Symmetry: C2
Subunit: 264 residues, 2 copies
Amino acid sequence: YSIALIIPSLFEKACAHFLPSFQQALNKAGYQLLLGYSDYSIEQEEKLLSTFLESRPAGVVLFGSEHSQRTHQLLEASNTPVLEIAELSSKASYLNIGVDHFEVGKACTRHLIEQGFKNVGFIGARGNHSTLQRQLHGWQSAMIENYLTPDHFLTTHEAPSSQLGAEGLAKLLLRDSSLNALVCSHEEIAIGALFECHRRVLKVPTDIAIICLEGSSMGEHAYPSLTSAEFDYERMGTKAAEKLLHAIKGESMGFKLKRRASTA
Amino acid sequence: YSIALIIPSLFEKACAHFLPSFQQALNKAGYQLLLGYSDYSIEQEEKLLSTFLESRPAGVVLFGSEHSQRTHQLLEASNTPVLEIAELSSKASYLNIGVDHFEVGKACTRHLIEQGFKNVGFIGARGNHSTLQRQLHGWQSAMIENYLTPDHFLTTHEAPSSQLGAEGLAKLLLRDSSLNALVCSHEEIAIGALFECHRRVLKVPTDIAIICLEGSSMGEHAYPSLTSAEFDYERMGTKAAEKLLHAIKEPEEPTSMGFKLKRRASTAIN
């Protein structure tokens, strides 16, 4: 009478703010939480996955669509109900909660554009991962839609860092001094970028607008504040359990886009 | 036989950086890692720990010294080995590892003073948890020892945030404008503060100097970049694992693992 979650990483703000709410609501209704840590490892996902199943768990949640076939048909065998948090569901007989990043990327660069901020570069981290390619694409879309060329983006497969944000801006301005808006995949990148601006005495938003794709209380209280796309990982936390519980026996997450100082 | 670990927060560098090398090391030795989240809860820790113990032996590793009668029972009743990630260790026969935050406060704060910044405020959080109190004290020592009068501090039971460092700075300024440096318990805090200096046009460090008590690359690459204390929780990760592996495998040892003070702009003098 207890379920298992296994987690991709702990830097991920998604996981950070989702976890408590989840097992909290989960506790309120009977089941306990024996969770596991993958460190992004598909192999590890399995090892963990496997040994939890040794105790009949009936109910299991995982992140992403990427899983080993050598574990899919353990879950889709021992037939315990399974949620995936991700956009793409891998078996799609099992349940799903995921966000549209493409839309997030689009709405956000859309916002800069209807802001008079037409020369928009894109700095992103954590690529090699399905979500960043969708953010890029959403950006590239919002641009073209508006007769504008998506020339200026930089990315890595590494984790979001302020250094990145700062060195990204530098690299960008050095290509195009006219750059006057910046999209940022993660909040750490935006803060670097923000500090870069101070170093450069480069007013924001009048010299540069800035926007974050997955923000929190940190950019909230930066200066100039930070306009970000913001999610309810606690509402998610909750609304996930309910799903699994509704499933165990019985019978399109959005985001507010917080308008702040770095756009005016 | 599998090995269990109950995390207190997801949001703390100490666990964030500790976990993945504590997984690696343990995994090379061949142990699966059963874990658990307790919203800084001694009570949930029980509910949870119980289940774990009732499952499979090995050893279990826990953060903090403050715990529960029933844990203290179960754990020491189970005769299985325990590792507190903590400075001091409850129930004598507990294996342990932790930094001494007091020295960190003190050393960071002598720095400001040796540097010439003699009127330091302090902002810290989760100050109903014991680590903050050891840092506060560290800071108050450094002040008093120099005849500096050490009562310009703010703490919350809440979690560290840059809003806290902004407003922190504000309220200290309003308490007393002569203020001219800050010790921040946390990197989010120091960032709030830095950014707020920018808002109020207080130059850093020549109007206010800043020093963070637990920096990461985050703060390293702010502007002006900030002097802070760093720790190697990745190594603690392996070292914790080693200490426990060497427990089940059987001699049992002191463990004086400290910190480096990265001197950067926010405390510099030209």
